RNA sequence: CCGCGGUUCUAUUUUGUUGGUUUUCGGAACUGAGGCCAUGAUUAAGAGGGACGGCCGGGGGCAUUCGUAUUGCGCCGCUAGAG
């Protein structure tokens, strides 16, 4: 039982943590090495009820802590990391939830593998939304 | 330019007795073979055109090739949120 494999004590098991930390949301999604099988997915939206702090560091770190206890529960010690922003033709830098989810996951008893950016980078995308005069504010 | 060949008519004579005048009479008509001309073309625009040589360029047109992205769809996984 214990919802895990028969791995030895010294040997560590690697998951893959896709962090789609965009603006207005912070996806934390731990899958296996293939990516076709997920272990746990917690988001700042499901950790807060204010609807404006869904990309906030507080909600992102709550999601990171919650997914950490699930990974330890199911028997995962190490974790590769694939950070991802909105991508496409829209913004390319990750939102505010990427950093707090990163620190909270590490400080909640987890190991870190290799960190890579997997933001979708078009060669040349379709026309962006907003018009030629942009978002007048 | 300088002469020499080569063709049609015409001012005029007086070969004053008329008639006949040669009138080539003088010159002007078309032309063949020459000599000579120092024989005859200014230079080649830091003007232009063109040719020639090697390169150069998101120049143009046609065909071909690749890229991830966006959107949608088909199977798989866990979740109540996603935007
Ligand atoms: Mg303004």
UniProtKB/Swiss-Prot annotation:
Region (Disordered): which ranges? 117-137
Q: Which UniProt keywords apply?
A: Cytoplasm, Isopeptide bond, Nucleus, Phosphoprotein, Ribonucleoprotein, Ribosomal protein, Ubl conjugation
- One GO CC term of this entry? nucleoplasm
Cross-link Glycyl lysine isopeptide (Lys-Gly) (interchain with G-Cter in SUMO2): located at? 47, 49, 92
InterPro entries referenced in this protein's UniProt entry, alphabetically:
Ribosomal_uS11, Ribosomal_uS11_CS, Ribosomal_uS11_sf
Q: Is the Cell membrane keyword given for this protein?
A: no
Where located?
A: Cytoplasm; Nucleus, Nucleolus
Spans of biased composition, class Basic residues?
A: 128-137
Instruction: Point out residues bearing the modification Phosphothreonine.
Output: 119
Q: Which domain of life is it from?
A: Eukaryota
Q: Which GO terms describe its biological process?
A: cytoplasmic translation; erythrocyte differentiation; maturation of SSU-rRNA; negative regulation of transcription by RNA polymerase II; ribosomal small subunit assembly; ribosomal small subunit biogenesis; translation
Phosphoserine modifications at? 2, 125
Does the entry annotate any disulfide bonds, and if so which pairs?
A: none
Query: Which Gene Ontology MF annotations are present?
Result: mRNA 5'-UTR binding; RNA binding; structural constituent of ribosome; translation regulator activity
Q: Name one Pfam family in it.
A: Ribosomal_S11
Q: Which PANTHER family match?
A: 40S RIBOSOMAL PROTEIN S14/30S RIBOSOMAL PROTEIN S11 (PTHR11759)
What quaternary arrangement does the UniProt entry report?
Component of the small ribosomal subunit. Part of the small subunit (SSU) processome, composed of more than 70 proteins and the RNA chaperone small nucleolar RNA (snoRNA) U3.
Its family? Belongs to the universal ribosomal protein uS11 family.
Q: Which HAMAP family match?
A: Ribosomal_uS11 (MF_01310)
* NCBIfam families tied to this protein: PRK09607.1 (NF007176)
Sum up the protein's function in the record's words: Component of the small ribosomal subunit. The ribosome is a large ribonucleoprotein complex responsible for the synthesis of proteins in the cell. Part of the small subunit (SSU) processome, first precursor of the small eukaryotic ribosomal subunit. During the assembly of the SSU processome in the nucleolus, many ribosome biogenesis factors, an RNA chaperone and ribosomal proteins associate with the nascent pre-rRNA and work in concert to generate RNA folding, modifications, rearrangements and cleavage as well as targeted degradation of pre-ribosomal RNA by the RNA exosome.
Please identify the protein, giving its name as recorded.
Small ribosomal subunit protein uS11
Q: Name the source organism.
A: Homo sapiens (Human)
